[PDB]
């Protein structure tokens, strides 16, 4: 609630991911801006190692919930800003239905004026011509609701939600998300009553960009209380 003040106005973002899926190494670097007042994120991510061995949509969730818009009557339920600048750790298992599993570990914290997300991603059990490794996913991302609950004993929060990726053949590839977040610092944080975040994203491409990349526009709002 004191860290709320760091997200007035527009904040530069740096994202950095080191990944390994079924042995294929790759790095992603992203940069952009976030405006929590309007719950709006604009970012451009670039695969620095070459061609991205997975579809870009499967990395959206891994690639900064502190930029969500919490209505005034919900401010005391915003865990993510309360942890700043000191930051938080974010851990996920992402289980793709009848395909592999991603495991991710990340620090989200300020480094000066910039909010940084450093991620380590680990992927196993992907069938070499599934929807993921066989690049069979549409270049888009559907709207979702992320349900948050408190994790009082780790002084953090948890979330469970389902991501529905559109497959180029009309079917839908689903990805179960299990997530927990813990303060990095010792200072106090807001622990919340169960709410959800409602998200909407637009994916696009930079025509002047030759590297494999993703431009992303996100709008996130908190809801579900009183």
């Amino acid at each position: 609630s004191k860290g709320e003040e760091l997200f007035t106005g527009v904040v530069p973002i740096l994202v950095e991911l080191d990944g390994d899926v079924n042995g294929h190494k790759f790095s992603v670097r992203g940069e952009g801006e976030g405006d929590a007042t309007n719950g709006k994120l604009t970012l451009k991510f670039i695969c620095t190692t070459g061609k991205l061995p997975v579809p870009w949509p499967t990395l959206v969730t891994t690639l900064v919930q502190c930029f969500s818009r919490y209505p005034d009557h919900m401010k005391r339920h915003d865990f993510f800003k309360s942890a700043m600048p000191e930051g938080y750790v974010q851990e996920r298992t992402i289980s793709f239905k009848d395909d592999g599993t991603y495991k991710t570990r990340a620090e989200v914290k300020f480094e000066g004026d910039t909010l940084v997300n450093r991620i380590e991603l680990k992927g196993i059990d992907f069938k070499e011509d599934g929807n993921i490794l066989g690049h069979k996913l549409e270049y888009n991302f559907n709207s979702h609701n992320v349900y948050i609950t408190a994790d009082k004993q780790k002084n953090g929060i948890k979330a469970n939600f389902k991501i529905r990726h559109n497959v180029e053949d009309g079917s839908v590839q689903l990805a179960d998300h299990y997530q927990q977040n813990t303060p990095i610092g010792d200072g106090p944080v807001l622990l919340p009553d169960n709410h959800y975040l409602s998200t909407q994203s637009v994916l696009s491409k930079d025509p002047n960009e030759k590297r494999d990349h993703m431009v992303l526009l996100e709008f996130v709002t908190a809801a579900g209380i009183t």
Partner: nanobody, 126 residues
Framework: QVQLQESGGGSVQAGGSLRLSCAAS????????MAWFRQAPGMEREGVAA????????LYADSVKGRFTISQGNAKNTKFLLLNNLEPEDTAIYYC?????????????????????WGQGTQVTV
């Protein structure tokens, strides 16, 4: 959880130079703001030099007078502190400190409570 290799102390005559090392082994997604403090015999820990994770900000205390330089290491969270033009007043044990918590500014860098993980130090004698 996170561990601290520190190396490269020793002894010199007035004017000489030594290079301290420090590396942080831990989760490879973690970044640390890294510093060296030094403690004289019965005096307190004071700040010497400090540098952000990316080498983008580098800070020195008044006792340094542009004689000491931090340089970024080969690897992720590893750095060297080069001590030039050493004088007997610089004799002390030199502790590597790491800050994992995020930060908005570096005004606090000279306080030991700004950090999170400390070394055992190394001796530096002239």
């Amino acid at each position: 959880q996170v561990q601290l290799q520190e190396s490269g102390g020793g002894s010199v005559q007035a004017g000489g130079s030594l290079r301290l090392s420090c590396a942080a082994s831990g989760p490879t997604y973690s970044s640390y703001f890294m510093a060296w403090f030094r403690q004289a015999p019965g005096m307190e820990r004071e700040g010497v030099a400090a540098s952000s994770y990316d080498g983008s900000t580098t800070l020195y205390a008044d006792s340094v007078k542009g004689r000491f330089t931090i340089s970024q290491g080969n690897a992720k969270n590893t750095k060297f502190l080069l001590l030039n033009n050493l004088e007997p007043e610089d004799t002390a044990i030199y502790y590597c400190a790491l800050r994992r918590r995020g930060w908005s500014n570096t005004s606090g860098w000279k306080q030991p409570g700004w950090y999170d993980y400390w070394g055992q130090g190394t001796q530096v004698t002239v």
